[PDB]
Structures are given as C-alpha cells and as structure tokens.
Amino acid sequence: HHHHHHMVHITLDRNTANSWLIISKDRRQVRMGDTHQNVSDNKERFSNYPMVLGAQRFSSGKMYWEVDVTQKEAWDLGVCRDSVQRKGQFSLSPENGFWTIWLWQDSYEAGTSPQTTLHIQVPPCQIGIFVDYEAGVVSFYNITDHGSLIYTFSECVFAGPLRPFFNVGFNYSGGNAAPLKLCPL
Numbered sequence: 739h740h741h742h743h744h745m746v747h748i749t750l751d752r753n754t755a756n757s758w759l760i761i762s763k764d765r766r767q768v769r770m771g772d773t774h775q776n777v778s779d780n781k782e783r784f785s786n787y788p789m790v791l792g793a794q795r796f797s798s799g800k801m802y803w804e805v806d807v808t809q810k811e812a813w814d815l816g817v818c819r820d821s822v823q824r825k826g827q828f829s830l831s832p833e834n835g836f837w838t839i840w841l842w843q844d845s846y847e848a849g850t851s852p853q854t855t856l857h858i859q860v861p862p863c864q865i866g867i868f869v870d871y872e873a874g875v876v877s878f879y880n881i882t883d884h885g886s887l888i889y890t891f892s893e894c895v896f897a898g899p900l901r902p903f904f905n906v907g908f909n910y911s912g913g914n915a916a917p918l919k920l921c922p923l
C-alpha cells in the first residue's frame with residue numbers, strides 16, 4: 739500500500755475509557771490495569787469491555803495510523819461511529835456502527851455479522867488502519883509482513899463522524915497484559 743502519506747497523529751480520549759484502563763501521559767498507549775483506576779463514572783465510558791476511543795473525529799478525507807499489538811493474545815482494532823452504544827452488551831458489527839478486526843483464541847476475524855475468518859500467514863506485531871471517508875472504505879494492513887492486506891470493508895455506511903476504536907482485551911490468562919501503542923509516523 740501507498741497510504742502512509744495520509745498519516746494522522748492519533749491520541750486516546752481518557753473520558754471514553756473503561757475505568758480499568760491506564761492511558762499513558764502522552765495519550766499514545768493503553769493497557770489493562772489490575773483494578774479500577776480511581777476515576778469517576780460518566781455516560782461516555784465503555785462499561786462492559788476494556789475499550790477506549792481516539793480523541794480525533796473524522797467526517798471526510800483519507801486517514802492512516804498504525805497500532806502495536808506485540809505479545810497480546812486478544813484485542814479489537816478499527817473505527818466506529820461517534821454515537822456507538824457505550825453501556826451494556828453489544829456485538830462489533832457495521833449494523834452497530836463498528837468497522838473492526840480482532841484476535842481471539844489464536845484466530846484473526848473481521849467484525850462482520852456473522853464474523854469473517856482472516857487468513858494471516860505472519861502473525862502481526864503492528865497493524866495499519868486506512869479510512870477513506872468518501873469512498874466508504876476501511877482497510878487493515880500487516881506491517882510485520884511488508885504491509886500485506888488483511889481485510890477491506892467496502893460500501894461502508896458510516897452515517898456519522900468516525901473515531902479510532904481500541905479494545906485491549908481482558909487478561910484472565912495473565913498472558914494479555916501488554917499495551918496497545920500508537921506507533922510513530
């Protein structure tokens with residue numbers, strides 16, 4: 739891909755984070771804490787899952803960013819509508835305002851309804867995410883494997899401003915404590 743030139747500087751929005759997340763001072767890294775992180779509750783926070791949004795909102799143009807997933811066993815990444823549900827149970831699907839992929843139990847899947855099996859030969863340590871707002875496209879790239887395509891959502895019906903979307907996953911196993919990190923340009 740030749741998408742690097744639409745690079746955008748993404749930062750995480752503390753106010754949207756699940757109350758167990760720890761966001762770094764520079765707002766570029768997030769990880770699961772061992773406990774509640776001593777913040778007040780609000781209507782923006784994701785309640786059920788270890789999710790957080792980027793601060794940036796996109797309503798036009800082409801945007802690209804990269805995320806480090808090194809040594810994580812579980813995570814979700816992509817974009818979502820600014821108006822997605824925050825409280826209670828929900829599935830990650832375009833019908834609910836999410837355009838995502840994930841790792842879970844040694845398999846990679848795209849957040850379609852129902853979910854779609856991904857074919858990745860080289861387990862990625864960094865993922866590139868490309869959004870073309872006007873074209874209705876969200877694409878995912880394997881930076882570890884020379885930028886190879888992972889998945890393209892096309893004919894997307896965004897239906898509002900988009901925000902970068904992150905899930906660090908639970909850490910029941912003790913093997914998923916590693917952070918998600920926004921990689922430098």
Ligand SMILES: NC(=O)N1CCN(c2ccc(F)cc2)CC1
Pocket residue numbers: 769808809810915916917
């Ligand atoms: N202070 C902590 O408890 N951390 C932070 C660093 N961290 C980690 C990072 C990379 C990796 F590959 C594996 C684990 C574990 C959680």
